[PDB]
Design a protein around this ligand. Structure first.
Ligand SMILES: O[C@H]1CCCN(c2ncnc3[nH]ccc23)C1
Length: 167
């Protein structure tokens, strides 16, 4: 039993809710919140911009030190950093950004990072401003993640469409 509330159950391990991931994180304080990161951990817009703003830019400061030490992530890769005031940990995961021409096949590799954590709050990778089909992203999530994932879907029209079209 965990403290996630109001989610629709999609499968054995995947749950979905129309919710602002920032407001969700601030309520649940999950062990892991997933950020829709880029390889540079530049948290400028989309989910990443929102999560960083909620940390008063502490996420960005920590991220810049991470990059200065380690260099960029790989597309499809991840790193674990602090969750600041939102969660214990933030798993920064890089899905391919279609608006940069990156290979959508790397979306499965990106979701594989979730399997290293027993429970997560997460967005649909590569959705929104990353330019991928959110229905496809949800499918890859369901077919790749085996741990317990709670998906926060910001856009109401998409949440209802995601539910109504789910197979
Ligand atoms: O355009 C959308 C694409 C998918 C990721 N995304 C989000 N998902 C959940 N909660 C959120 N809060 C602020 C942004 C956001 C933005």
């Amino acid at each position: 039993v965990n403290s996630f509330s109001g989610y629709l159950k999609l499968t054995d391990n995947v749950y979905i809710k129309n919710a602002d991931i920032v407001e969700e994180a601030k309520k649940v304080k999950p062990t892991v919140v997933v950020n829709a990161a880029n390889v540079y951990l530049k948290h400028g817009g989309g989910v990443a911009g929102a999560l960083n703003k909620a940390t008063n830019n502490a996420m960005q400061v920590e991220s810049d030190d991470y990059i200065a030490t380690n260099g960029p992530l790989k597309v499809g890769g991840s790193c674990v950093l602090s969750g600041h005031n939102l969660a214990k940990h933030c798993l920064h995961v890089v899905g391919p950004n279609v608006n940069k021409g990156e290979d959508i096949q790397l979306l499965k590799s990106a979701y594989e990072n979730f399997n290293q954590h027993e429970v997560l709050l997460a967005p649909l990778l590569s959705a929104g401003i990353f330019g991928a089909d959110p229905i496809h992203s949800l499918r890859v999530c369901v077919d790749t993640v085996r741990t317990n994932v709670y998906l926060a879907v910001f856009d109401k029209n998409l949440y209802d469409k995601l539910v109504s079209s789910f197979l």
